[PDB]
């Protein structure tokens, strides 16, 4: 049905932020964002592409299972968490992109195209660098075209082996309590302007599930922590978190 | 190797409680315990059967999925909690009986008996009712027999699909974020004495996964927070959590 809900502007607007949150309700099948418009402008999607990324390299062997151990190359970044050995799980968890870098190289262009063709990915186009298009290629996806890929994915319906599917949700997992259940991914885009925050997913709750996409213009890294609390306090005021 | 770490009892002390807290460190290999010998005793698995009900289930069609919907049957009992509509999920979660007792009937005594002998799972005894042998019968498990089970499901080693496993694992989720993943499954032995309280799973982390069991004795309901509480205890004193 997809209504709009001006009254979360103020959640970044006290952040002297602008973004987007989208809300999809699975049980009611109706959809709620603050702008309709951004809802389904298309933006790089960055590291929120790890998680067709992985899909592609679990179903084409690149990647055995999530305990497969991904050895650190040795040289030292700017990032603290990058600089160890890392799994899928964690390779995600700190949106660890060299290691996933090594998995594009492997899958290839041909391969990846095609699976992003039947994913229904985004724009599907992976123009630029096979190891960095998500960063600064060709590949576009908006808020509303990330539900209705996680919505295919939460049911196992990708054209990828259900295994495939689970192990990534699996990876996807971000907070849990006797409240509710979050997997999402985290992601940030600063190569090509606008620099925006993103974080995509759903709540699953004990009668419900809310799939959930949004993004936020984020000129810096210090206000990253933003795409949660945002996301968290649109939560709160839909009674949908404690 | 096993080593006794008799410590941990002051946190049993403390509460008024007697019980046995059994860990695995899964990369060195290591187990410690504050009581090796009841961590050796076999007791009822009470609700902590669902693990192994689960697989089953899944395993032989009986539930489709974790999505799968069972109705309540109408009969009003003194848990809130189960008188509603649950899935798998659900079910788990609130450690909803008559859900796990149709299970049962439909697995039927053939197969579960096949099916706990493949899991190696405590003396592979169902006497009694196929409905409730988990509670009143003669099935008996250890602590440690528990986490030797936990540690075959978690690397996909039990004797059914890869499917059924990663579906009751995603079930046993309990409590996650930025620090640790926790898997688990409560439990309550009443209907046999010693009245005793379960908690069996995992911590996951990020460089390592600590598997543990745990039973305490149980004479009142008042003191199942216990549970947990007593078994966070000896996960800060070992610096595993915060």
Redesign the interface.
């Known amino acids: 049905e997809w209504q709009e809900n001006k009254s979360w502007n103020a959640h970044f607007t006290e952040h002297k932020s602008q973004g987007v949150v989208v809300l999809w309700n699975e049980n009611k099948q109706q959809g709620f964002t603050n702008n309709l418009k951004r809802a389904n402008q298309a933006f790089l999607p960055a590291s929120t592409f790890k998680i067709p990324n992985s899909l592609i390299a679990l179903d084409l062997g690149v990647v055995k299972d999530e305990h497969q151990v991904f050895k650190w190359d040795g040289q030292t970044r700017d990032i603290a968490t990058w600089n160890r050995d890392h799994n899928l799980i964690?390779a995600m968890?700190y949106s660890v992109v060299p290691v996933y870098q090594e998995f594009a190289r492997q899958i290839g262009e041909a391969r990846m195209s095609k699976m992003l063709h039947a994913f229904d990915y985004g724009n599907e186009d992976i123009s630029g660098n096979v190891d960095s298009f998500w960063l600064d290629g060709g590949i576009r996806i908006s808020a509303t075209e990330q539900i209705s890929f996680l919505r295919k994915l939460y049911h196992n319906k990708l054209h990828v082996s259900?295994?495939s599917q689970?192990?990534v949700?699996?990876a996807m997992?971000?907070?849990?309590?006797?409240d509710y259940?979050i997997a999402a991914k985290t992601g940030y885009s600063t190569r090509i302007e606008p620099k925006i925050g993103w974080w995509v997913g759903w709540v699953e709750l004990?009668?419900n599930v809310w799939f959930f996409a949004m993004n936020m213009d984020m000129p810096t890294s210090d206000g990253l922590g933003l795409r949660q609390a945002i996301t968290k306090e649109v939560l709160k005021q839909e009674k949908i978190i404690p």
């Not at 997992?173 to 006797?178: I, K, Q, R, V």
């Open positions: 964690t968890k259900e295994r689970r192990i949700k699996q997992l971000t907070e849990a309590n006797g259940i004990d009668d």
